């Protein structure tokens, strides 16, 4: 989830938030 | 009116101020606040605020803020003015090249206006006493050229150097003899006279006399403000006899190149034999002398008194003074000149030395300050020279002092100069027909 | 009662503290490395369980 | 106020950098939201060295994770101090370096480093006084070695009047877990030279012997490894963010200890470290902490200094401590071993001592070591280069991206001069001078 | 032989100058001299007094 | 203990003793004294 | 003040010196787990010359135990005063020597000396004035013999002005137990002479007379042996540690007892033993300790001091007493066994007192003789070493190793050489 773009990114949740 | 004003540079000059201002300010009984509980004794060494607040005549100096904010947050932050502790914001890293030329170079404005406006305050002024070491990068660089500008700035006001000397052992560095070259060769001609002060022969006295096993820094600076005051007891309370700065400036300098006295003092002793010894004026005059009690680490066996400064406080008579001074003349183990058949001076004062709480002296009646001027501080030199020389033969530690501001003669000049000082000292030492 | 009197205490190896008297220590923390990850205290019991899940 | 930035490359790198956090974070009393929680002043009067203020009294690294691979900012981000980072400070590619050096130097690399300076300049100017460079990285993958390299040249070439200091993982001839090693670390050596105030080699078999040995752990894991680097690390700058009898940062450590612009490999120490079942038999003292930290097995490289000659040496000892005992210990090992230093230097070993210990403990040392024994080191490396490429192996994945074949021959040269220079500096007569001087001037 | 060559590149070799930087408050706060304005540069500009 | 011969060719700075012949004869009774 | 760094080699050397950690912590009142529970104030006085101290107000011993097999290091860390030793203090090897002094002295012993003589250093270097070194072993053995004789050798070569103290034991004709014994036992006498101090010679079969014949035990268990070694080892330094009247150390006694550099054998003795039995019906006094203590019937050697000529004696008391007594009886022995003693020597005693006495017994004594006859000891280990060589019994064992044959035909040649020394110091005339 962190690791990818912003652009590419489906709806996910990222890490501590 | 006589005053005098201090002038801490580095860290330990910081750390010897901070013993010696809580000494002066128990002597004087002014508490950390900086107000008293007629008397006017205190303004050799304390300004007078109209509301009664008492502000030091001192300058702290140093280029790293570590030790400057123990003293802005600990327990004399309320004693001190805040604008006469100066603090730099990168070490001078143990060159002498930073500390004269690249780093040192930016704040001198600075202190010089700070030590102007304090010398305006003086109805009279007696002279500077600079506090430093010749190790450090602050303390070999800033005090060079703080006594260059200093003597550009006042014309022959006089200058004592309290200077810890390197140990001819330990060291806490590497570059300490290219430090003390480089700083021996500026003060040789900018300054007026030069107490040496070394840290093994003062642990040394502490691991014999005072009965404690590990020493501290905190440890040496009682001592050390205990020596200073001692050297001011005869400017704040009067005496018999009374030795002002100028006075044992004329007489422990007989040449142009030779001012570097040797401090010693006595009684150091616990209270377990203080309960034992008698401390009479002939034994605490003894004390001095003896070899094993000098407070640098050299044997005056080796080398010829050229001048004596005696200076005793308390209970203590002419006759028992002089009656001593005889016996030490003729005593064959001590050895003077032939050039000087008086060799002596000395200075009587009535107060007896304080004692603060949690310190490591007894409480005595009498005692005794030496500062002697031998010849047995050529094998100091000698060895000094060895040492930088025995570096300097592969130009190891040159390219910090080289691109940083300086070149590379000064190095061989500065060798140069202190050889023909080792042939000064051999000349004054040789003895007439 | 003079200052700096820890330094030279003759019983200051008599007042001392081993610093690891057991493994449920508050003070021996990440900084202070008295104590590391690697020391398996619960090898034998994760041993015994793997057998049994064998 | 002298900062300190910090650099972390590749997964070596940045698994140090989470367990230095970890451990500093800890020392200063700070939790992994950001905030203090503490029982002492003294612990936020120099907090600006490595943490950046942020709103409602937060505190954030001073630190930029650099990669080529996205795997692992995943896992240092879920780590276990991993929120207490900045997510801008994260700076990573997405084709890995696959253990090349080539791709990290010249394809994937340089078009990392425009990213990369842009964050580095950011968090560089905004400092008050700059204080130096950290990078922690490893000469045996493709992302730490070569544009880890590549960062130093740059940053060499814009900030020239700083300090900048290298933790190199440099690689091991027995824990050797990659074939390729020897190009990366061979290539790696020269932009290390000459573009470097200190750099410190760890070893990753030297760690190993360490645990096993002095701690005797049942499983010396990658966390404890990085446990005793990090412990190296905090103990070199514990005295710019905490005060002390004698104080001595970077700069005053690297004055003393580099006579020589191209001698900066150190070898490092820690010292109290102490195995579950020896602890309540001994007894914490500085004579027992100068004693242990001088030992072979104690080194963090692995370089036995037996087989050479101590150029310099400093310790930096921790804790409410006596002066004269450390200074009579320093003076008594140099006056015992007398062959094992090297005669133009009297006085070798540096003191610096620092009043705050860490955390839970009573007294603690650092030990840093410039030998001639590094050289030993390079030679196995430039021996294992050189079997490889006598007969060509590997070379089409270098020489297919961008490099010609002298490259390899002009940094085998320069590691030949290195090591000619070691040895010429440790079989060097004391007692003379000549062919340089001014053929006794004067008369 | 490393020796001598460090040798003769330390003594063929010059100091570099200082940019000069004076410190105004009791806390270090650097500042460049030059344009500051505590320094007479602008006076010995070549068209000073003639237009 | 040990000098270069580069700083061994460097003379006095004071000049104490009246005359040369007197400065020798002094130095002469030292060494032989020493 | 004077620190004594103690060594173990071999199993027996390991049960020698556990026994004798658990008398003298008795002595000096320390429990099992390491701390002090005593009664005096003399207790902890004189303690730095055996223990280190650590944190907490814990005392470990200042001794190395070294093994080739790991089998003996168990049994003594799991014995009732194992927990006292620091666990570095055990190097232990791997493989064993399997009764081989030359396994023990080139080929497994090469390795482990590395390893032991860090530990000596680290526990050398630590003291502030180093009295010396003291060792226990046998030469029945692998382990304890051959590489026993190197570490006397490198630690002779690293530490030349020091003292040397070794409680040597060496074998019996009749409580043999190793074929090859006679190849270790000869092989490192050479070893022995040219780099110890003092040697004191113990024998098993010595040992079992005395605990059948005075102690009257029915199982005279190695337990009991190594209580009577331990209670004449600690006699030898009872006078560094406690305060008396007239004091004698290591080196005091090894002044007065070694008149030549190759005479430093020496047979002990130890005085106060009385069965169970007999305990109330002996009466504790001088004289009863004075003519116990030179009874032939006492020795701790193979050795008969009748068949020779006693050189030197020693004689270390402890307990409070009169100086007269003790004078007048040392007195009388030498008058009265005239023809027991050399001539060439006058006042061929030396006498030490010590104030306190050994836990629960009032007086006690020790006794260190140089006599001639522990020279037919050699004689018979020289004559049976030479009954196997001229058959080369066992060789491909010592040779296949990597010794050469010269090293018996010199150690022979060595040893009797010193036993002819020996008969020369026998016969010697008053004048000449
Ligand atoms: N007598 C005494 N000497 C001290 C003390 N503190 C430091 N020194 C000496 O100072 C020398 C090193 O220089 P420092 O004073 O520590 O530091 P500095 O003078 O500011 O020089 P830099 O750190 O390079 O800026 C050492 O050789 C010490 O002997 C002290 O408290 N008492
Ligand atoms: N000390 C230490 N070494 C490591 C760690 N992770 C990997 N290594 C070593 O580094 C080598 C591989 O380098 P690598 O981490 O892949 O470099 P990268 O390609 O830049 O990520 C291996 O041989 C490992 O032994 C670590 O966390 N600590
Ligand atoms: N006096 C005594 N002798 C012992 C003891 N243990 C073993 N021995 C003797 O030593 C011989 C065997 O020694 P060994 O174990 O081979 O010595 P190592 O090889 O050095 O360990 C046997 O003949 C025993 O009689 C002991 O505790 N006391
Ligand atoms: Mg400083």
Redesign the interface.
Request: overall charge negative; hydrophobic content about 30%.
């Given at each position: 989830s962190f690791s990818t773009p912003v652009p590419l990114s489906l709806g996910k949740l990222l890490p501590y938030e | 009116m006589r005053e005098c004003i201090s002038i801490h540079v580095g860290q330990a000059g910081v750390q010897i101020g901070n013993a010696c201002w809580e000494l002066y300010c128990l002597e004087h009984g002014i508490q950390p606040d900086g107000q008293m509980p007629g008397d006017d004794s205190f303004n050799t060494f304390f300004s007078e605020t109209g509301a009664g607040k008492h502000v030091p005549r001192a300058v702290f100096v140093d280029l790293e803020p570590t030790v400057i904010d123990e003293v802005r947050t600990g327990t004399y932050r309320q004693l001190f003015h805040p604008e006469q502790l100066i603090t730099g914001k990168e070490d001078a890293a143990n060159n002498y090249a930073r500390g004269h030329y690249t780093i040192g170079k930016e704040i001198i404005d600075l202190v010089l206006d700070r030590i102007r406006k304090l010398a305006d305050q003086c109805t009279g002024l007696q002279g500077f006493l600079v506090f430093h070491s010749f190790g450090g990068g602050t303390g070999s660089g800033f005090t060079s050229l703080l006594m260059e500008r200093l003597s550009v700035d006042y014309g022959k006001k006089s200058k004592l150097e309290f200077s810890i000397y390197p140990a001819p052992q330990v060291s806490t560095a590497v570059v300490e003899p290219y430090n003390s070259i480089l700083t021996t060769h500026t003060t040789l001609e900018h300054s007026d006279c030069a107490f040496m002060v070394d840290n093994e022969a003062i642990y040394d006295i502490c691991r014999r006399n005072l009965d404690?096993?590990?020493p501290?820094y905190?440890?040496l600076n009682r001592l050390i403000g205990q020596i200073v005051s001692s050297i001011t007891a005869s400017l704040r309370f009067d005496g018999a006899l009374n030795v002002d700065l100028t006075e044992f400036q004329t007489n422990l300098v007989p040449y142009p190149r030779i001012h570097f006295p040797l401090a010693t003092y006595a009684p150091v002793i616990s209270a377990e034999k203080a309960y034992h010894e008698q401390l009479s004026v002939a034994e605490i005059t003894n004390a001095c002398f003896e070899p094993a009690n000098q407070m640098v680490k050299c044997d005056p066996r080796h080398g010829k008194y050229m001048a004596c400064c005696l200076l005793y406080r308390g209970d203590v008579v002419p006759k028992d003074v002089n009656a001593a001074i005889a016996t030490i003349k003729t005593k064959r183990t001590i050895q003077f000149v032939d050039w000087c058949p008086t060799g002596f001076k000395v200075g009587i004062n009535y107060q007896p030395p304080t004692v603060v709480?949690?310190?490591?002296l007894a409480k005595v009646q009498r005692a005794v300050c030496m500062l002697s001027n031998t010849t047995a501080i050529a094998e100091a030199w000698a060895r000094l020279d060895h040492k930088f020389d025995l570096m300097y033969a592969k130009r190891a530690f040159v390219h910090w002092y080289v691109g940083e501001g300086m070149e590379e003669g000064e190095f061989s000049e500065a060798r140069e100069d202190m050889a023909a000082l080792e042939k000064d000292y051999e000349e004054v030492g040789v003895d007439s027909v | 009662?003079?200052?700096?009197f820890?330094?030279?205490d003759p019983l200051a190896?008599?007042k001392?503290?081993?610093?690891?008297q057991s493994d449920n220590?508050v003070?021996?923390?990440?900084?202070?490395?008295?104590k590391?990850?690697?020391?398996?205290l619960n090898?034998h019991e994760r041993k015994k369980f793997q057998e049994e899940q064998n | 106020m002298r900062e300190i930035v910090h650099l972390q490359a590749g997964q070596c790198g940045n698994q140090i950098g989470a367990k230095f956090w970890?451990?500093?974070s800890?020392?200063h009393g700070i939790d992994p939201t950001g905030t203090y929680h503490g029982d002492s002043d003294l612990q936020l009067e120099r907090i600006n060295v490595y943490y950046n203020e942020a709103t409602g009294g937060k505190y954030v690294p001073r630190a930029v994770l650099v990669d080529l691979e996205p795997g692992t900012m995943d896992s240092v981000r879920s780590g276990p101090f991993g929120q207490i980072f900045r997510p801008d400070n994260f700076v990573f590619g997405q084709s890995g370096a696959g253990n090349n050096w080539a791709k990290g130097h010249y394809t994937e690399g340089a078009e990392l480093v425009d990213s990369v300076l842009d964050v580095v300049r950011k968090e560089a100017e905004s400092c008050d006084c700059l204080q130096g460079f950290q990078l922690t990285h490893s000469l045996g993958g493709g992302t730490g070695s070569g544009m880890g390299t590549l960062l130093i040249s740059k940053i060499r070439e814009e900030y020239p009047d700083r300090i900048m200091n290298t933790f190199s993982v440099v690689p091991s001839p027995k824990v050797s877990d990659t074939v390729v090693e020897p190009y990366n670390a061979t290539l790696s050596v020269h932009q290390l030279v000459e573009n470097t105030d200190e750099t410190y080699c760890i070893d990753n078999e030297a760690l190993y012997d360490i645990?096993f040995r002095t701690?005797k752990?049942?499983?010396?894991?990658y966390?404890?490894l990085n446990?005793?680097v990090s412990?190296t690390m905090?103990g070199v700058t514990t005295c710019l963010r905490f005060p002390g009898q004698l104080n001595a940062d970077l700069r005053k450590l690297a004055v003393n200890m580099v006579p020589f612009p191209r001698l900066h490999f150190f070898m490092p120490g820690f010292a109290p470290?102490?195995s579950?079942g020896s602890?309540?038999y001994?007894?914490?003292?500085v004579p027992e902490l100068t004693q242990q930290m001088f030992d072979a097995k104690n080194m963090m490289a692995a370089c036995d200094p037996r087989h050479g000659r101590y150029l310099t040496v400093a310790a930096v000892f921790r804790g409410?401590?006596?002066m004269k005992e450390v200074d009579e210990q320093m003076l008594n090992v140099q006056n015992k071993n007398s062959s094992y230093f090297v005669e133009w230097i009297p006085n070798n070993v540096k003191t610096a001592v620092c009043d705050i210990?860490?955390?839970?403990?009573?007294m603690?040392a650092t030990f840093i070591g410039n030998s001639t024994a590094i050289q030993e080191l390079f030679k196995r490396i430039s021996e294992q280069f050189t079997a490889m490429f006598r007969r060509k192996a590997f070379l089409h994945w270098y020489t297919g991206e961008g490099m010609d074949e002298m490259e390899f021959t002009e940094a085998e040269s320069n590691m030949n001069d290195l090591v000619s220079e070691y040895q010429q500096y440790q079989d060097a007569t004391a007692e003379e001078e000549g062919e340089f001087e001014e053929e006794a001037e004067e008369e | 032989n490393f020796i001598n060559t460090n040798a003769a590149d330390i003594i063929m070799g010059v100091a570099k100058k200082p940019k000069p930087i004076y410190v105004d408050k009791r806390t270090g706060d650097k500042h460049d001299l030059e344009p500051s304005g505590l320094v007479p540069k602008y006076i010995n500009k070549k068209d000073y007094g003639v237009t | 203990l040990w000098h270069m011969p580069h700083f061994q060719k460097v003379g006095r700075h004071l000049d104490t003793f009246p005359t040369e012949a007197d400065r020798q004869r002094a130095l002469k009774a030292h060494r032989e004294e020493c």
């Open positions: - | 404690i096993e590990r501290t905190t440890n709480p949690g310190g490591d | 009662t003079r200052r700096e820890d330094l030279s190896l008599k001392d503290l081993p610093a690891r220590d003070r021996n923390t990440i900084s202070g490395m008295q590391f990850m690697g020391e398996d090898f | 970890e451990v500093i800890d020392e645990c701690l752990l049942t499983t010396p894991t966390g404890d446990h005793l412990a905090s470290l102490t579950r602890q309540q001994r007894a914490l003292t409410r401590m006596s210990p860490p955390r839970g403990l009573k603690s | - | -």
